[PDB]
Amino acid sequence: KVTMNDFDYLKLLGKGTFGKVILVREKATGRYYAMKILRKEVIIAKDEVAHTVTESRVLQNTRHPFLTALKYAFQTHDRLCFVMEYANGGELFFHLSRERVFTEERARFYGAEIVSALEYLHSRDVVYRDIKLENLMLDKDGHIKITDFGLCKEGISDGATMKTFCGTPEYLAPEVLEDNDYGRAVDWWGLGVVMYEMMCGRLPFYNQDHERLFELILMEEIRFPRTLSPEAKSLLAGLLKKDPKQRLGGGPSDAKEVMEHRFFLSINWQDVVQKKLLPPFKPQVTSEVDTRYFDDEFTAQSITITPPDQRTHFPQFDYSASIR
């Protein structure tokens, strides 16, 4: 049984209201991982139990080069811990914040890998629902690693629907901002937003006030830099079509519509999944504990245990990759 003192706790990689993520060393092997630590108290209060159990359940059976691999899922009396692959290259958000914009070529590389992962998830009836730059990390070679599966939905095949109002506001599809249910096409909209950010250096829609933001998402016409290629303009127009039935990827062939798009004309899709495409950017990390692609805001902070206030057991948190 895996416990807290099986790991050394080295650096804070990220923190939010959800909890915290820490660079750990596994004592027994000396190998480095990221550990997401969540307080059960917060999870229950927020009504996120089912979502968090689902996060473990999906990760236990997913295997794909561009999804983050789970090593352990374990828990204590007051905490839930995910031990997972450390994405040395950090978030795409980090890189785009520094570089401001990616070339169409570089965006195409990341985009092809995200499309590959979303095809795989959708084939297994999983809707990810949280595509954003913050959840798109890079491994040490510069390949995509999708992280944070805390808003996934299972059992969603072509035409099936979902009702939970969830996601990140700036990335929410217009149909989610309407009453009743929505389908898997929301993931393609999400790819639309991140592709737009990568090539245009800004969100297609933004206001600090969510009420204004959601009106923009529902109502505003997207704009493009004049210099963008016709097929990049076509790709983003198709992914960010407000009607999910008319959206690129929103038909019965799902990822195939996106894969066959003229923006990805140069891409051989079997090379993508086989990791044969060369990353344009290779993270220049020089050790296993190197956190240069993570914000100082987090890594400067000292690690500190929070004071707490019968069975408090969560299912799906006694998992090991060695055992299943």
Ligand X SMILES: CCn1c(-c2nonc2N)nc2c(C#CC(C)(C)O)ncc(OC[C@H]3CCCNC3)c21
Residues identified as active-site: 130
For residue 245, CA distances in Å to 4, 179, 184, 240 come to 47, 16, 11, 12
Does the protein bind a copy of itself through residue 3 (CB under 8 A)?
A: yes
Q: Which is nearer to a copy of itself, 28 or 265 (CB)?
A: 28
Query: In this structure, how many other beta carbons lie within 10 angstroms of the beta carbon of residue 21?
Result: 24
Pull the structure tokens for residue 69: 């691999």
Pull the structure tokens for residue 218: 């529902």
Does the protein bind ligand X through residue 170 (CB under 6 A)?
A: no
Q: Which is nearer to a copy of itself, 11 or 51 (CB)?
A: 51
Residue 15 annotated as part of some ligand binding site: yes
Residue 241 annotated as part of some ligand binding site: no
DSSP string, 185-225: THHHHHHHHHHHHHHHSS-SS--SSHHHHHHHHHHPPP---
Cβ–Cβ under 8 Å, residues 72 and 83: yes
Per rule CB under 6 A, count of chain residues that contact ligand X: 21
Does the protein bind a copy of itself through residue 45 (CB under 8 A)?
A: yes
Does the protein bind ligand X through residue 68 (CB under 6 A)?
A: yes
Contact characters 148-187, a copy of itself, x per CB under 8 A: -----------------x----------------------
In a 13 Å sphere around the CA of 195, the CA atoms on its Cβ side amount to: 30
Give least dist CB 85 to a copy of itself, A.
11
Contact characters 128-167, ligand X, x per CB under 6 A: ------x--x---------xxx------------------
Q: Looking at beta carbons, which pairs linking 211-214 to residues 24 or more positions away fall under 8 Å?
A: 213/169, 213/170, 214/169, 214/172, 214/177
Amino acid (one-letter) located at 24: V
Residue 135 annotated as part of some ligand binding site: yes
Does the protein bind a copy of itself through residue 309 (CB under 8 A)?
A: no
What are the residues binding a copy of itself (CB under 8 A)? 1, 3, 5-6, 17, 27-31, 42, 45-48, 76, 165, 208-211, 214, 321-323
